[PDB]
Design a protein around this ligand. Structure first.
Ligand SMILES: CC(C)(COP(=O)(O)OP(=O)(O)OC[C@H]1O[C@@H](n2cnc3c(N)ncnc32)[C@H](O)[C@@H]1OP(=O)(O)O)[C@@H](O)C(=O)NCCC(=O)NCCNC(=O)CSCc1cc(-c2ccccc2)on1
Ligand SMILES: CC(C)(COP(=O)(O)OP(=O)(O)OC[C@H]1O[C@@H](n2cnc3c(N)ncnc32)[C@H](O)[C@@H]1OP(=O)(O)O)[C@@H](O)C(=O)NCCC(=O)NCCNC(=O)CSCc1cc(-c2ccccc2)on1
Lengths: 379, 378
């Protein structure tokens, strides 16, 4: 009796930034219009980004009030934390209320809380703040995952599976919330990686309810979490790095990350399915939620697994409509896949297919996979 | 077939700071010898600390090279992180190798890693760094617990229990490591909480191996992890607060923390043991590992549970010889208990008793308890 995803909810900040407008906005508000060299590079990145819009908490007024945020290397962690330590739990609350509504049970039935964010850190943590906001039982069993990065949307499902399967009757609320205000940096030719994050990173929160043994006529499973695997891709420690500094959360992104993912995807898929049935080819038989760290990562997975046109539609849709929101993104993709499956009259939440995978990719490079089964479309 | 603790190892930095000498050291190296008011307050706190010595990575030469560390409020996070992001995994490695030696199995048999620290934060994290240092399998399943605080020595056992019990054959390495360089602050009459941390906080690392179904005649259990509970004590959000800031990890401590623990201990103990048996427990029938956040917390547990003289000896011994090292401290206490039980010829690792508890206490206030059973000495 495996752990099941029983509900998914999502949320984003209200302010929409269309990619067509973002170069103009970024260069104007950061006083960098003279950097026509960097604007050329940024335009090219945005054109290739396959991201049409993003939701962001950060506003121009916040930058005007705190110009150190766009002054590369200037001290600004404290103002960023003052924002994110409040806004991350709040955005998580909105997603959680949506998941709880879908789930249909009283909040008092939640026994476990996993909160994940790479956007802030505080003691007590976001988990404690969310307990207050939602009125969760004060004795909920908590896991607070700080600063894991972009594999964690799969990792939190793995953790929830073990908690839900080993604790009879447990119901795990999983909340992943990101506010990228802490990662916003100004522009310098000595740190061009910032142009990539400025084009792709975005804000959002997901909430998932996980439990084994669904209650008939109340609970309705969407996916089953069958097996998981986490691995470090060889010789890729420089792939994604982020340091918590006086200047905020600074980050570095190697241009070789897509090549590392493509060079390892057959292997990490094969070793994951060794835990299930030994599948080693014919990857088009699965449905997929792939963390869209950037468009080239999605393209590498498609190419090296030999995926047919449209196999990664749900992944690409979320990248287009929301950008890379970090750990929550794969949950947005599962929600989109469930929604489109309803629209199309599919027999299951996984595009009509039985088996699928979630692929999270982040620092290490670390890849966490979760093999899922879909569920029949009901209620 | 519950999860069992199969090994415990510990480590500390090499520099010993005897409490008798610490006020002189602190006020000299931070250039505060003129603050006779603050010195008298600090002397009184140290006298009541029940801490005889502590091990610290921080040295006077580091303070001389980085005086922003002792200049209250000055930007210093970057230098602190540059130290702790290296030193936390290295100290954890030392403790882990000791645990792995006791366990007696190859490093390649470890399937899961939990790393816990409140002393630093980085991406990739300390778990990744420890994988490199030890040569763990690159596919170990990891949980990296950053900035939980002083309840986490119980929490990591709860997490290890679930991972070990839900994954056949799993062997979990758990490492908690603290280097308080990130929490060191200078002295100001506007923030007297620093005097308490300066008297009590200390450095150390623990490592525990956890697995269900130990191999007969190859692995030897020390304790069984039976059941766990985490709870927030009502109306105590101001008890322990720590913020990650440009000045380092700043913290505030309410003088009411001991009274909050005492006012809730019967309840949290009762509700924890309700998860195991419906009969009332005699608290003196248990062995105890209590997080010694300060001496008054230990006294409050003793008083409100009606514990007999000497029941908390192992807890008090660790506080005396090591100070409050954060999350690892309860593991040092279990190790001390096991060692003293060998010395005394007791029949079990838990002072000759069958049932016991680990009590972790930290921000929230949050208390996490883990009910243990002892094992035969063998
Ligand atoms: C970049 C595109 C779209 C462009 O398209 P393209 O590169 O395919 O085409 P082309 O190469 O021909 O042109 C592109 C031109 O841009 C330049 N160029 C590309 N790449 C880099 C780079 N890497 N450095 C410096 N320059 C770079 C080249 O130089 C080239 O110019 P030139 O070479 O032709 O002269 C594509 O590559 C792609 O998807 N890349 C993969 C990106 C990647 O790593 N995603 C993983 C994201 N990881 C993280 O977020 C974790 S980190 C800190 C952190 C963040 C969070 C978080 C995040 C979000 C939300 C909440 C929290 O939590 N933690
Ligand atoms: C304090 C003693 C020893 C005194 O001994 P006493 O009671 O016998 O004598 P008395 O009270 O009569 O006299 C004492 C004099 O000091 C003053 N005074 C006392 N109390 C406070 C306070 N609260 N504020 C401001 N002044 C305070 C009085 O006013 C009096 O002043 P004056 O009148 O004499 O001048 C005793 O009370 C006691 O144990 N209390 C409970 C202590 C406690 O909660 N520890 C919680 C530990 N939490 C944490 O580590 C997490 S936090 C940030 C953080 C740290 C870490 C971490 C830590 C270690 C390692 C790795 C990571 O991760 N995160």
């Amino acid at each position: 009796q495996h752990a099941k995803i029983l509900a998914i909810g999502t949320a984003n900040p209200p302010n929409v930034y269309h990619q067509k407008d973002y170069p103009d906005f970024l260069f104007r508000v950061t006083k960098n219009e003279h950097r026509t060299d960097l604007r050329e590079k940024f335009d090219r990145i945005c054109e290739k980004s396959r991201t049409k819009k993003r939701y962001l908490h950060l506003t121009e007024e916040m930058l005007k009030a705190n110009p150190n945020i766009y002054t590369y290397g200037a001290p600004s962690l404290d103002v960023r934390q003052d924002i994110c330590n409040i806004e991350v739990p709040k955005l998580g609350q909105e997603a959680a209320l949506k998941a709880i509504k879908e789930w249909g049970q009283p909040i008092s039935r939640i026994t476990h809380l996993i909160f994940c964010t790479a956007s802030c850190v505080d003691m007590p943590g976001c988990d404690f703040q969310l307990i207050k906001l939602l009125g969760l039982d004060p004795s909920v069993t908590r896991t607070m995952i700080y600063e894991a990065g972009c594999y964690a949307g799969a990792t939190v499902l793995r953790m929830a599976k073990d908690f839900a399967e080993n604790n009879k009757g447990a119901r795990v609320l999983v909340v992943c919330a990101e506010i990228t205000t802490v990662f916003f940096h100004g522009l310098t030719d000595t740190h061009l990686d910032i142009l990539v994050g400025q084009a792709l990173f975005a804000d959002g929160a997901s909430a998932v309810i996980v439990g084994a043994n669904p209650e008939p006529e109340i609970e309705r499973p969407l996916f089953e979490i069958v097996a998981c695997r986490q691995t470090i891709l060889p010789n890729s420690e420089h792939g994604v790095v982020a340091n918590i500094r006086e200047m905020g959360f600074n980050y570095y992104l190697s241009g070789d990350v897509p090549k590392f993912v493509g060079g390892n995807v057959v292997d990490f898929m094969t070793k994951t399915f060794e835990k299930v049935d030994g599948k080693k080819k014919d990857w088009n038989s699965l449905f997929f939620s792939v963390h869209p760290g950037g468009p080239a990562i999605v393209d590498q997975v498609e190419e090296k697994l030999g995926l047919k046109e449209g196999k990664l539609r749900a992944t690409r849709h979320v990248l287009s409509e929301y950008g890379n929101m970090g750990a929550p993104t794969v949950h947005f993709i599962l929600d989109e896949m469930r929604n489109k499956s309803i629209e199309e009259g599919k027999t299951t939440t996984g595009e009509g297919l039985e088996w699928g995978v979630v692929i999270g990719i982040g620092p290490g490079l670390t890849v966490e996979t979760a093999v899922l089964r879909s569920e029949s479309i009901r209620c």
